[PDB]
């Protein structure tokens, strides 16, 4: 394999971290290839669930706990810390909140969160590499509680970063919030991508095409599919009770992606940096509820 950038995997990984049996597990957790029968059973549907009152409560809870866990990870970002060490802390924090770390054994994914450094777009596997001054790193948290998944991510600075890093991360956050600000009953899912690309392009950045936002509730991913690029053909229209993510991945260079031999790590083909932010949203009558919102600050971590 020809690596696209300076990043390499740092193996071996520590043995798989156990989750105590008292934590309720998603169906894929104990499947040998980490396949989900309930996802298999709904695979291919276009229908978007309208959440019940119970469902909304369950999504509010799991999304609040996911935020708490991302906040644990944020507090550990500094030169010298390995992404594996961040994952360890994340794993323990999930368990301390009586949640299952949704990524663990999802289609045999080996870790409890995704850590995406520099040219990694998404799905980076926590490993023995210490974070370096100048790096950007995304931490993506997904938790499972009482039958519901919640999903969010932020990009962080590792010490002092260059002006390009500041601009990429700022612009990416702005893309997310402009998309969020458009969410309300009667808006087409395909419209969010127009908004995102418009801002990205204005700032000299490109938009990843192979990865999209998604429905989430009883399944980790389901309808709707939410591309972040302009003039997409996503299907469907927002209604009150829809829950989905918006999670734009923006790149310094070209939009094209490729996967490492690990089968998960998505990288820019050109080796330039990519940044991402993600919230889980519930569509309401006024607009939306940001279920994964930070509660003790108006701002994401990179702004402090
Ligand atoms: C809908 O899929 C999702 C993908 C997904 C759920 O497949 C992932 C399994 C998750 C883990 C944490 C290992 C991710 C990681 O959320 C990125 C966005 C989207 O990526 C694509 O759209 N593709
Ligand atoms: Co997501
Ligand atoms: Co995510
Ligand atoms: Co899947
Ligand atoms: K990245």
XYZ file of C-alpha atoms and ligand atoms in Angstrom:
331
model
C 0.000 0.000 0.000
C 1.168 3.543 -0.852
C 0.350 5.918 2.094
C -1.057 9.254 0.922
C 0.621 11.359 3.617
C 3.088 11.281 6.509
C 0.671 9.356 8.815
C 1.207 5.629 9.354
C -0.585 3.083 11.637
C 1.212 2.466 14.969
C 0.701 -1.215 15.866
C 0.265 -3.531 17.663
C -2.921 -2.449 19.354
C -3.668 -3.294 22.939
C -6.005 -6.324 23.313
C -9.676 -5.572 22.813
C -11.109 -3.725 25.839
C -13.920 -5.707 27.570
C -17.279 -4.162 28.380
C -18.849 -5.575 31.615
C -21.821 -7.864 30.970
C -24.197 -5.555 32.936
C -23.980 -2.944 30.156
C -26.689 -3.543 27.611
C -25.151 -4.420 24.233
C -26.305 -3.705 20.646
C -27.027 -6.891 18.584
C -23.748 -6.588 16.593
C -21.607 -6.560 19.739
C -21.549 -10.382 19.952
C -21.822 -11.197 16.262
C -18.592 -12.790 14.936
C -18.212 -10.315 12.024
C -19.922 -7.528 13.994
C -22.965 -7.515 11.711
C -26.263 -6.140 13.038
C -29.377 -8.263 12.315
C -31.646 -5.233 13.029
C -29.637 -3.135 10.471
C -29.627 -6.043 7.989
C -33.444 -6.280 8.469
C -33.968 -2.560 7.660
C -31.132 -2.314 5.075
C -32.219 -0.434 1.928
C -35.290 1.397 3.373
C -36.034 4.976 2.386
C -38.670 5.456 5.086
C -37.666 7.827 7.904
C -38.830 7.040 11.379
C -41.012 9.532 13.207
C -39.776 9.288 16.772
C -42.223 8.543 19.633
C -42.162 10.496 22.917
C -40.290 7.547 24.469
C -37.822 7.575 21.557
C -37.134 11.298 21.962
C -36.411 10.834 25.680
C -34.052 7.928 24.897
C -32.256 9.981 22.198
C -32.003 13.020 24.469
C -30.368 10.888 27.184
C -27.871 8.972 25.024
C -26.887 12.140 23.141
C -26.307 13.996 26.414
C -24.051 11.142 27.665
C -22.183 11.066 24.297
C -21.455 14.793 24.744
C -20.118 14.102 28.233
C -17.754 11.467 26.812
C -16.501 13.681 23.960
C -15.808 16.323 26.640
C -13.647 13.733 28.513
C -11.643 13.162 25.289
C -11.286 16.908 24.597
C -9.627 17.391 28.028
C -6.903 14.926 27.071
C -5.784 16.477 23.774
C -2.123 17.517 24.041
C 1.256 16.685 22.435
C 2.524 13.314 23.651
C -0.887 11.619 24.293
C -1.574 8.576 22.012
C -4.967 8.168 20.344
C -5.079 4.724 22.016
C -4.851 6.470 25.444
C -7.732 8.745 24.434
C -9.733 5.664 23.426
C -8.963 3.957 26.768
C -10.364 6.965 28.666
C -13.372 7.118 26.302
C -14.042 3.386 26.871
C -13.977 3.825 30.686
C -16.155 6.954 30.469
C -18.773 5.128 28.385
C -18.910 2.285 30.932
C -19.114 4.787 33.831
C -22.327 6.140 32.176
C -23.803 2.591 31.694
C -23.390 2.887 27.972
C -21.879 0.569 25.342
C -19.236 2.212 23.040
C -21.168 1.839 19.734
C -18.037 1.514 17.458
C -16.678 -1.477 19.382
C -16.988 -4.565 17.131
C -19.258 -2.648 14.705
C -18.336 -4.780 11.637
C -15.331 -5.810 13.715
C -14.099 -2.213 14.258
C -11.436 -2.770 16.989
C -11.768 0.317 19.275
C -14.384 2.324 21.167
C -14.187 5.614 19.210
C -12.648 7.013 16.015
C -9.593 9.296 16.142
C -8.864 11.006 12.806
C -5.514 12.882 12.671
C -4.584 15.369 9.822
C -5.208 13.600 6.448
C -7.568 11.046 8.016
C -11.068 12.085 6.971
C -12.907 9.738 9.327
C -12.898 6.291 10.986
C -9.332 6.449 12.201
C -8.365 3.644 14.532
C -6.907 4.708 17.905
C -3.289 3.449 18.008
C 0.187 3.944 19.601
C 1.031 7.194 17.790
C 1.483 10.154 20.165
C -0.188 13.316 18.970
C 2.354 15.860 17.674
C 2.369 19.647 18.140
C 0.723 21.096 15.049
C -1.636 18.121 14.472
C -5.407 18.424 14.146
C -7.445 15.494 15.496
C -11.101 14.621 15.271
C -12.615 12.473 17.963
C -15.936 10.872 17.016
C -18.017 9.457 19.864
C -20.989 7.116 19.422
C -22.724 5.660 22.551
C -25.474 3.082 22.986
C -27.960 3.216 25.841
C -31.289 1.456 26.379
C -31.721 0.674 22.654
C -30.635 4.111 21.279
C -27.403 5.429 19.694
C -26.100 8.979 19.927
C -23.338 10.444 17.691
C -21.122 13.554 17.681
C -17.581 14.657 16.820
C -15.280 17.647 17.035
C -11.868 18.488 15.591
C -9.253 19.668 18.086
C -5.910 21.460 17.857
C -2.819 19.779 19.339
C -0.798 22.699 20.756
C -0.178 25.495 18.251
C -1.299 24.847 14.736
C -0.581 26.674 11.491
C -2.910 29.269 9.915
C -4.147 26.707 7.353
C -5.237 24.409 10.213
C -7.066 27.267 11.969
C -8.884 28.258 8.780
C -9.850 24.645 7.857
C -11.250 23.869 11.325
C -13.047 27.272 11.609
C -14.573 26.913 8.150
C -15.651 23.288 8.875
C -17.440 24.365 12.087
C -19.107 27.271 10.186
C -20.278 24.756 7.529
C -21.890 22.614 10.201
C -23.637 25.505 11.928
C -24.940 27.080 8.650
C -26.428 23.650 7.763
C -27.925 23.262 11.243
C -29.404 26.764 11.065
C -31.402 25.682 7.886
C -32.980 22.651 9.577
C -36.764 22.771 10.061
C -39.902 20.945 8.783
C -40.261 21.101 4.945
C -36.576 21.529 3.984
C -35.195 18.916 1.584
C -32.335 16.811 2.992
C -30.512 17.467 -0.307
C -30.437 21.224 0.424
C -27.923 20.979 3.363
C -25.149 20.024 0.902
C -25.695 23.177 -1.177
C -25.203 25.281 1.944
C -22.115 23.349 3.088
C -20.304 23.336 -0.269
C -21.055 27.037 -0.836
C -19.177 28.004 2.384
C -16.360 25.443 1.949
C -15.697 26.497 -1.669
C -15.727 30.196 -0.772
C -12.846 29.454 1.600
C -10.873 27.351 -0.923
C -11.829 23.948 0.542
C -13.400 20.792 -0.898
C -16.152 18.518 0.445
C -15.786 14.763 0.938
C -18.388 12.833 -1.137
C -18.055 9.214 -0.054
C -19.217 9.793 3.549
C -22.568 11.333 4.571
C -24.668 12.279 7.595
C -27.340 9.760 8.483
C -30.415 8.861 10.421
C -29.703 7.476 13.840
C -31.808 6.080 16.701
C -32.377 2.321 17.256
C -29.784 1.801 14.456
C -26.392 3.511 14.289
C -27.082 4.466 10.689
C -30.308 4.496 8.712
C -32.433 6.754 6.535
C -32.026 9.519 5.718
C -28.751 9.794 3.824
C -27.383 13.341 4.079
C -24.576 14.275 1.628
C -22.595 17.433 2.444
C -21.836 18.400 -1.220
C -23.848 20.533 -3.671
C -26.403 19.173 -6.164
C -26.730 15.765 -4.530
C -29.793 13.606 -5.078
C -30.629 12.736 -1.469
C -34.233 11.762 -1.014
C -36.744 13.129 1.423
C -37.996 16.085 3.327
C -37.562 17.019 6.965
C -40.503 16.556 9.316
C -40.951 17.077 13.061
C -39.713 13.918 14.827
C -36.916 13.163 12.309
C -33.456 12.480 13.953
C -30.313 12.563 11.867
C -26.695 13.744 11.839
C -24.941 16.477 9.928
C -21.168 15.811 9.896
C -19.341 17.640 7.103
C -15.796 16.519 6.249
C -13.884 19.364 4.554
C -10.433 19.141 2.958
C -7.491 21.494 2.260
C -6.962 19.835 -1.108
C -9.132 17.590 -3.239
C -12.269 15.787 -2.083
C -11.187 12.275 -3.119
C -10.848 9.619 -0.395
C -9.286 6.148 -0.153
C -9.253 3.464 2.604
C -6.174 2.041 4.351
C -5.601 -1.742 4.329
C -7.162 -1.815 7.842
C -10.491 -1.440 5.950
C -11.593 1.579 8.065
C -9.158 4.517 7.947
C -10.400 6.963 5.290
C -7.733 9.365 4.071
C -7.412 12.137 1.502
C -5.891 10.661 -1.684
C -3.663 13.815 -1.854
C -2.451 13.590 1.775
C -3.685 17.057 2.740
C -5.675 17.685 5.937
C -9.378 17.131 6.562
C -11.556 18.358 9.426
C -15.043 17.372 10.604
C -17.802 18.363 13.109
C -20.944 16.448 13.875
C -24.175 16.861 15.812
C -27.251 14.568 16.099
C -30.374 16.681 15.439
C -34.081 16.227 16.247
C -36.396 18.142 13.896
C -39.075 20.069 15.886
C -41.866 22.445 14.796
C -39.694 25.575 15.256
C -36.503 24.067 13.761
C -34.370 21.485 15.547
C -33.032 20.428 18.890
C -29.249 19.923 18.914
C -29.223 16.746 21.034
C -25.389 16.570 21.302
C -24.935 20.259 22.138
C -22.313 21.290 24.636
C -24.239 22.417 27.766
C -21.512 24.303 29.724
C -20.337 26.408 26.757
C -21.768 28.185 23.719
C -18.639 27.157 21.723
C -16.758 24.016 20.599
C -13.485 23.051 22.224
C -11.186 24.389 19.490
C -12.335 27.953 20.290
C -11.038 28.002 23.929
C -23.624 6.046 7.307
O -22.233 5.713 7.583
C -21.558 6.697 8.350
C -20.313 6.044 9.013
C -20.949 4.718 9.489
C -21.898 4.848 10.710
O -20.406 3.491 8.934
C -19.879 3.824 10.145
C -19.707 2.870 11.308
C -19.227 3.609 12.530
C -18.136 3.398 13.276
C -17.968 4.379 14.376
C -17.062 2.388 13.059
C -19.670 7.100 9.946
C -18.359 6.688 10.634
O -20.661 7.586 10.881
C -19.291 8.307 9.078
C -20.477 8.916 8.318
C -21.189 7.861 7.473
O -20.281 7.343 6.502
C -20.830 6.998 5.232
O -21.773 7.661 4.871
N -20.270 5.980 4.542
Co -22.488 10.127 12.334
Co -20.020 10.140 14.223
Co -23.104 -0.168 8.345
K -8.563 14.807 10.286
